[PDB]
């Protein structure tokens, strides 16, 4: 929704499913997955951020 806002993940395949992550950047220039989110826990690959579509995030 906005920079720095916490969002609950809804991507079923995501390692951070049902977890809270902070939005880093949002691309207003179209794009299918514009909302970059960062989570505290690192996934199995060691990364802690991913791009999601606004439909795949619960706002708060």
């Amino acid at each position: 929704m906005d920079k720095g806002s916490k969002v609950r993940n809804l991507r079923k395949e995501s390692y951070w499913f049902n977890e809270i992550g902070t939005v880093v950047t949002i691309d207003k220039s179209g794009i299918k997955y514009p909302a970059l989110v960062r989570f505290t826990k690192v996934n199995y690959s060691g990364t802690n951020s991913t791009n999601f579509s606004l439909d795949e995030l619960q706002e708060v």
């Binding site: 609950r8 079923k12 395949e13 951070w16 499913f17 049902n18 977890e19």
Partner: protein, 161 residues
Amino acid sequence: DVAGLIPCNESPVFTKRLNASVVKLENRVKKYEAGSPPALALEQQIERTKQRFDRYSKSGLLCGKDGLPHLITDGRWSHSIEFVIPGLMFLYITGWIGWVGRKYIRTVGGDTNATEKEIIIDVPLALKIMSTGFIWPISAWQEYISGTLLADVSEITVSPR
């Protein structure tokens, strides 16, 4: 009584085992001069064996056909001494431990260096938490009825849930 077990107080096989242990220790000590350090050690072993067998006889344990004590663990109060009483102690001690641990996890977890505080323990805070475990059952029940014990369904899961 219980399952055809005769109390170890009147168990001939129990006394035979005691005699065998004592006599074998005596045969072992017969090859040392009286008063030699080995002789004193063996005599102390004999005394400890006699005390162990006497304590078992006086305790009220139930012997089998083999002469060894058997434990009744069906909840019988007369035999709680065998399993119920120690078990409670365990569930207390471990409970304490567990509770304390959980608290530490939930105390240092609200920090940026939460990971760094697990390899390196905050000994002052750690002892602060550890000293509070003697009331772990009450605190656990209070958290349970207060909703602060369990996390909501909104937590990590897998594709098929």
